[PDB]
Symmetry: D2
Subunit: 397 residues, 4 copies
Amino acid sequence: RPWQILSQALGFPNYDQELWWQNTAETLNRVLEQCDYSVHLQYKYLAFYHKYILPSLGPFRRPGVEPEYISGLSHGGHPLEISVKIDKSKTICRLGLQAIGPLAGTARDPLNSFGDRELLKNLATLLPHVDLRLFDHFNAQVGLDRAQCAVATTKLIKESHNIVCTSLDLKDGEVIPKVYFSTIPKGLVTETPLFDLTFAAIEQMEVYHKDAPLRTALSSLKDFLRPRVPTDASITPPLTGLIGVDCIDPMLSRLKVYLATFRMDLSLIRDYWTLGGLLTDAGTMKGLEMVETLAKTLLPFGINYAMKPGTAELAPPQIYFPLLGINDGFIADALVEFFQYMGWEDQANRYKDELKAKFPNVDISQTKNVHRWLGVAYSETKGPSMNIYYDVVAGNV
Amino acid sequence: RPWQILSQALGFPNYDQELWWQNTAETLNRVLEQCDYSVHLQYKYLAFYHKYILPSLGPFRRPGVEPEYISGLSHGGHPLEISVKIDKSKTICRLGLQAIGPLAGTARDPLNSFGDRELLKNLATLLPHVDLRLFDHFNAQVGLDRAQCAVATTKLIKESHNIVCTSLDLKDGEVIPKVYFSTIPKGLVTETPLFDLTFAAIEQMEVYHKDAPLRTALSSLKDFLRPRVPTDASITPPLTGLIGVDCIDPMLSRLKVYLATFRMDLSLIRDYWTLGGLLTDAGTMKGLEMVETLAKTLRLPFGINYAMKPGTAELAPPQIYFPLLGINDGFIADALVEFFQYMGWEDQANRYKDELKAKFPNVDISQTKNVHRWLGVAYSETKGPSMNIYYDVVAGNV
Amino acid sequence: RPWQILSQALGFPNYDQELWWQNTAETLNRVLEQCDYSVHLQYKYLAFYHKYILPSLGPFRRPGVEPEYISGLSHGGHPLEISVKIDKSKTICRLGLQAIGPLAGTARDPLNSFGDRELLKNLATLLPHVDLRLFDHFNAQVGLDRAQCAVATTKLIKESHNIVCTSLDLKDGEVIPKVYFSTIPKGLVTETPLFDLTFAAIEQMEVYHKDAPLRTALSSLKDFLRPRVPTDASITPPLTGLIGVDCIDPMLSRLKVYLATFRMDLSLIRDYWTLGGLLTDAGTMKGLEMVETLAKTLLPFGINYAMKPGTAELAPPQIYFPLLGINDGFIADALVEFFQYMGWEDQANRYKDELKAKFPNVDISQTKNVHRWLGVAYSETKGPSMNIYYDVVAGNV
Amino acid sequence: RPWQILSQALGFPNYDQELWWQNTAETLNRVLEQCDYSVHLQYKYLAFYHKYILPSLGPFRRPGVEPEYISGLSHGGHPLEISVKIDKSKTICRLGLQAIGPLAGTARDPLNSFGDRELLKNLATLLPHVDLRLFDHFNAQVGLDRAQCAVATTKLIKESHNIVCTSLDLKDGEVIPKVYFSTIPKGLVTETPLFDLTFAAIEQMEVYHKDAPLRTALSSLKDFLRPRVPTDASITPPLTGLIGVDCIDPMLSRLKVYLATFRMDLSLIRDYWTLGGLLTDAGTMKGLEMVETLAKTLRLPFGINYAMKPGTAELAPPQIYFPLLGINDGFIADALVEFFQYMGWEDQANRYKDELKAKFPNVDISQTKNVHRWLGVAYSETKGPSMNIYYDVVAGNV
Ligand SMILES: CC(C)=CCSP(=O)(O)OP(=O)(O)O
Ligand SMILES: CC(C)=CCSP(=O)(O)OP(=O)(O)O
Ligand SMILES: CC(C)=CCSP(=O)(O)OP(=O)(O)O
Ligand SMILES: CC(C)=CCSP(=O)(O)OP(=O)(O)O
């Protein structure tokens, strides 16, 4: 099996990397098999994961060994998630991580400011299509000096001592990086409103200055958000908490503005999904039925407005439902029912057996931590989609 | 001696680092001694150099071993310079380099786009006051993807396959990084005028949006440069070829706009120094006599560097850089002694030649023409006159 | 293809490693395909080669870039060879290299004394069955301090500034290391006879002291060699120039004593093969016919006497014929004829097309450097074998 | 100060190295100052420590972070000791460590079999006089394959999962390595008596075969030890538990055979020191009074170390090591002052307590019982009396 072959061939530089492999790689290889990646792509991705991702993941938190840096990405504080993006026809595997520098969570690096850019630099000599210009732009806008980072750690819980995180889409035989920047540490430290920081950083992008359509989309977005998020410097949800970009040509990159809120009823779902009455068309409304049916059939909620250069009109967001604390057997039964509702008969018939087989060390009918998030979207061109985000480590124990 | 002691204590991870040390570290230790750094600071800076700078310098170009990446920083293609900044009261040592990545000058990294940021990342965990925000800003504005980098190499000579370089001021017991970004590769690849892209990148700075004084200074600078540099996309002089920042809090960083030109007579020196008649005050005019006297007392382009700081609205006179490559180093030393006497820097005059000899003991500096590379001169209202001398250390040692 | 997939997944830490891959890995993957290794084993070996062997190979000598260390292993000074061991039924791929330290061929490391042990140390945490005790034993016996190493470089050509080299058999899904130690630098520097050094080092082995059979074999070997090699300190072939061991349990390791000579006529072949009349049995004589037929159908010659603990009697040696300077098209036609002589019809029918396909950048009917060595052996239990050693780099240009 | 200056210049690759430095480097710099090393040598040894020793020390065991490998070298499981060797005329500083590989104490490396040789390889390219031949010889004789290593861990406590450790004498402006190999894991796994395997490994040395004097010394040693240590495979005292060599030319290396025992009265001290009546001369007998006086003036085993050199046929008296773990460090200091007065080392007596305090400023050394770990004493005919004091640096700093 590819994960086993690579272990045999490569070994491990240190014990932390060995443990990360022993607790994630079998699962990943299972995911890639189940999403119908060829064997050559299984090897591609697993070898990549070994060489580039294992060293970025830092120490493997476990009984008796408490890392200086604790991630918010998972229940046990491990900076890793594996996610699937499901259509009608295909499923795509993705990794989400924080790349942990070797002084992270200590005075020389209080918010783990460097690990993600170091990974991306390695990715840029590895991969011909990786572009760091949007990364560098937002790092310059929302990054903090060391003194500022220290101040931020006094005002945030241990699981939120971070500015950046990274995802890698394993798609089209390639690795496609995306990054997300948190606005919160900068908001806190400079006592600037999150709304102003977020849009100030966006409006200084080189692509913003060249693309009139993007400027039109953002002004619509701004007009929707301005009345709904704080005008002052509080961290009072609903709030503009992350900015997302693809690490590709800035003209092709999607710009992502993520709201976080703890409150989500039907009125709020409607309001977010339709941008307050702005989107009334039949595609948007079909999406909204889907989201409402999902809520019925079933950490902050997330609303992610994604914009692309050359497009003047906003689309409906992706909405993220937190699943931490809900039984994983129930979630699986709920998703099967939702998949039948969508007419995704093949996804419905396989979901629960393939979930078991991803996570053989665990009884999903007893766990509550393995599904962490679910995102749903509807695109005008691409159709409906579902993202399921798993705490791999929780599922491997 | 410190450079010897660190060799014995540290050794070398590879032969290229050993050769770098053997061709630069004696000289550097000499310079620090001559600028009256304490012994503890000599160790501090030499140990730092060994740990952080040696691995960043790449292969040591020499007969039989042609690196894939050739730097424009020195005559022999070595990515290193050492410079001294001389006042009346003190002398400061500084290093200039390019941090060479391990695939530099090959298809995976045609313009050496990553080494400098990697060095700076290491400097940020080392040093409590290092800030990368201006670095990242300009890297986003003037940097290029791989395909663009490959295009750029087809339009530039081998010595100009670069976007960034780094300097380290060894001052106040600290290491203070500065970086410089070339506008040329982006100008060439996007077929944009250098003036436009330089100012477009500056005007998108976070500090530009917060600081009215800086905007005002740049607006005056723009009015002066717009008529004097190309409005088209040519690389002809005078041109806006580099943008410089300090890797510190953006509010305290100096923003530097560097012109390169090959033509420099007395009228041009006047025009640059006074910003075309804009500066007429007595401090400016004293600076101008000094610079005129230097030009009289004495290939690469001339440089003119306008340096602007947040919170200051008015432009100051630039620093002017005289190129010295190809002029005998014994002559340059005699000229500098005379200039130092003119300034009333009697102590600097009396020591300059003997210290020059002692900086470069393994080569007869009176026979060479490549060791002094540049000379910069400035006058500040608050600081007084200054001189920067930039040496091709490797040419002084091989 | 696996070599391509790994390139894509892994990239390269530096340009030298990239060039080594671009000039050897396609060939290796071709060899492994032709010897019928499964795809999973192709990935195993190619991933291993990338992680462990590429960094050990040092700079890639090429026009404009002259390394400080020049290896004798190949025509262009590259420290690599790939070899095949051919039976009737199977073919085994092996790598031979010198692991180049980062100060090799300079004053801090004049004979490249450290790179091979550093590779083996990495192999010992990678592989459960690797044993370093025989390595360390012979390193202690024939290794030299820095001053001695400097003296040795003044008395040897640049291509002989070495004490150790390494081979890796790619067999049974495993990597099996072997090492060879040169007696010459120590002989030269201490003005000790090679015969005395070689046997002194052997007789101080822990296994020699425990195994009466081995002591009996070596005393027979000593009685054969003593009259035929110098009693003085000259490097006058025939001479005892290398000692070989397997990096496994000392009780299972074969101990190999290699003679080098520039003179090889029928009388000498006979004398070496039969240990001077000592071996007269029908197995030995069939071997000898085979070797004689090979010579007829077609750097020093090599004679390698291999002994194993628990066996009191000597076996016939392996004899190594240097092929440098003989046309590679001719060698292929000669080997095809020899394979027919042996009744290895399948090996005969495939040898020349598979040779072409290993080395697609080159016209074998014009080159003289690609076959470097041929070894032949006959074992009482295992049967006849042939080892062919290729200059991979010469074959890739 | 040098330890501060190197921190500022070098920083740390990871937090474990930072913590090591923060808990040992001040103390080390203190020791070097107190032994009258020049400032240049302080830098030399501190820079060396940073580059070569910090990464070899592994994780820094502390509350909340339990490393996979736990060393027996110190009370807190930290693989480091600092020791001073005191004469009448000088004091020499030495480091003892285990070089912790990155899979140590796990299935891929159960007895930490590789870190020490990796450090020594780095030392061989650093230092012109380092020689690995004796290291490799004993590693071949007493080392174990992985399966054997896993068996050994089932028969030994966690603090004894080791085969090798390393010491570095900081002497003559140089670093001189020594290594020690434990015979215990091989004794246990092969069910061989410790006496037999110790001498079997020694007798296969290349130098043993060339040097009649060394063979004669060992033959006398064997006659003395054979009746006193087990003839069976038990780990009971007295036992031959370590073999020591210098990593230098085998002809100049001292070969050290160390006994460990828990029982030490005046008759036993006499028996060990005189090799059972074998040594009766006036130098030996003066040494013996000294050692008797030390025992009177004052848990781990006692150590007795017989040290033999090629070209010497006759045995000398051993060095005897008194274990001090569990005895108050204020008391030990008062005892040593008294012993120093007895020796007529008035200067050593007058400074010992104040320097002890200043070596360990972040802990009150009068309250601790773990800081002095061992005391060794020797007498040479050619060299005079000596004392080695071994400190648990980490226990003195945390
Ligand atoms: C960081 C979290 C929990 C979600 C980010 S939204 P995403 O990038 O995972 O979703 P897409 O890949 O854009 O479909
Ligand atoms: C890199 C070159 C040739 C010139 C840079 S100007 P500088 O930064 O060296 O001069 P100052 O340090 O600003 O005085
Ligand atoms: C070093 C050279 C050219 C030959 C060594 S003999 P070998 O080990 O390659 O042959 P075997 O693998 O023992 O059949
Ligand atoms: C490692 C331990 C506890 C004792 C070793 S004896 P030593 O080598 O430290 O003493 P000397 O350096 O030989 O004086």
